[PDB]
Amino acid sequence: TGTGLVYVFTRFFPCPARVSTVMEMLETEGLLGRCVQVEARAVTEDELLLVHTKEYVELMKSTQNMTEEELKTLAEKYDSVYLHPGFFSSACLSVGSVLQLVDKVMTSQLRNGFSINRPPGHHAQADKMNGYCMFNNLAIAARYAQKRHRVQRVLIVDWDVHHGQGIQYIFEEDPSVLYFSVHRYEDGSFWPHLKESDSSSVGSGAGQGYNINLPWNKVGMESGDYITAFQQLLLPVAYEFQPQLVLVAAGFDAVIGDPKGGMQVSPECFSILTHMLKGVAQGRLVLALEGGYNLQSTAEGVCASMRSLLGDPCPHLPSSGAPCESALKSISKTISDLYPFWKSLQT
C-alpha cells in the first residue's frame, strides 16, 4: 500500500539536471513526501551476468582506471556513447535502484515504484554500450524477478520515443519476457535507424509473438494515438499474456516540448497510460527513467506518472480522444504482423 521512489545519478549536452529537476518538481508538488523513499544499491556481477557477457562486465569495470584518452577511444567504438571515469559506478547504482523496487514490489512491501535513475538502460546490449546506456537496467531487473522472485512472465513496456533495441535483442528468443515498444521510426530515418525496429520483428524461435514494435512514421503524435495504441494492441495482449510483473521503460522524450522527440503527447497522458498498466499483474508495476531532454517536460511526465502510481484521480486530457490516420495505419500493421500469435487481436 505504498509507492516507492529511489534516487541516489548527478555526477555523470543532452545533463545531470535531467534528474535533479524531476526531484525538485516531485518535492514542490507534494508527491515526494507521499512516496516511500527507498535506498539504492549497487548491482553485483552475478546480477549483471543475467544479461551481459563476462568479457563486457570486465571491460566496463576497467573503465574507471582509464585515462581521458582511453575513454574517448573506447567510446567511438560505440554508437552515441560518452564515457567518463564515474560511469561504471553510476551505472551499477542505476541497475541496483530498479532491483530495490522489484524486491519491495514482489514481496508486497509496496504496491508499485518509480526509480529516478541515470544512466538510462534500454539501449544497452549483451556485449556493448549504446545510446548512453552501459547496462540494461530493465532487462536485468526482469531476469532478476524471474530468478530471485520466481516470476514466470514479465511484461516490459517501453514508451520512450526511441526503440529500445537492447531490450529487444536480449529477449528476442524468449517467450517469458514480452517486450512492447512504441517509438518514432519514420521508416528508419529516426535514430537508431534499424530495420529490426519495424513491426515485422516479432521475435524468433520460441520468442515469436513476444516482441511487439509499434513504429510511428509521422511526427507530432498525440495522447489519443498512445491511448488508442494501448487500448487496442498492448492491453489485449497483456491480459492474454498474464504477466506477474510489469516493468516500464519510462522515457519522456515523447512529451510535448521535447527538443528531439518530435511528438506532442501531453504529460497528463502518462497518468492514463500508467493507470491502464495498473490493471495488469495485480498492479505490480515498476517504472524506471530512460530518456528525456526538456527538463520541464520530463519532470511533468514523471509527476503525471507518479500521481497514478499513488492512486490520485486521472486528470482531464486536453487533447482529442481520436487517433490520427497515420497512427491508425501503424497500429493496424502491427496488429496484422502479430495476428497469428494472440487470440485477443483476432477481432
Interacting residue ranges for ligand TSN, rule: CB under 6 A? 14, 80, 120, 131-132, 160, 162, 191, 251, 253, 260, 290-291
Q: Which three cell numbers stand for residue 50?
A: 543475467
Q: Within positions 166 to 195, which residues make up the interface with K ion, using CB under 5 A?
A: 171, 174, 179, 181, 183
The answer to whether the annotation marks 225 as part of a ligand binding site is no
| Closer residue to K ion in complex, CB, 3/165 | 165
334 binds, among ligand TSN, Zn ion, K ion, none (CB under 5 to 8 A by kind): none
Q: Within positions 192 to 211, which residues make up the interface with K ion, using CB under 5 A?
A: 207, 210-211
> How is residue 339 annotated by DSSP?
G
Report if residue 158 touches K ion, rule: CB under 5 A.
yes
| Closer residue to ligand TSN in complex, CB, 249/338 | 249
| C-alpha closest to that of 341 among 170, 214, 175 | 175
Site string for Zn ion, 239-278 (x = CB under 5 A): ------------x-x-------------------------
| Cα–Cα distance measured from residue 279 to residue 287, given in angstroms and rounded to the nearest whole number | 15
| C-alpha closest to that of 149 among 73, 247, 228 | 247
Candidate list 160, 222, 300, 337; residue touching Zn ion; CB under 5 A:
160
| Cα–Cα distance measured from residue 115 to residue 24, given in angstroms and rounded to the nearest whole number | 15
The catalytic residue among 52, 122, 123, 163 is 123
Residue of closest CB approach to Zn ion: 291
Provide the CA 35 distance to its chain's centre, in angstroms: 21
| Cα–Cα distance measured from residue 315 to residue 267, given in angstroms and rounded to the nearest whole number | 10
The answer to whether the annotation marks 160 as part of a ligand binding site is yes
| Closer residue to Zn ion in complex, CB, 80/228 | 80
Q: Within positions 161 to 190, which residues make up the interface with Zn ion, using CB under 5 A?
A: 162
Catalytic residue check, 123? yes
Provide the 3-class DSSP secondary structure of residue 5: strand
Strand order in the sheet with 3-6: 36-38, 3-6, 112-115, 285-289, 245-250, 154-158, 177-184, 211-216
Helix %, strand %, coil % of the chain (to 5)? 40, 15, 45
Q: Within positions 42 to 71, which residues make up the interface with Zn ion, using CB under 5 A?
A: none
Q: Which three cell numbers stand for residue 192?
A: 537508431
Q: Which three cell numbers stand for residue 209?
A: 509473438
- Under the rule (CB under 5 A), what is the footprint of K ion? 158, 160, 171, 174, 179, 181, 183, 207, 210-211
Catalytic residues: 123
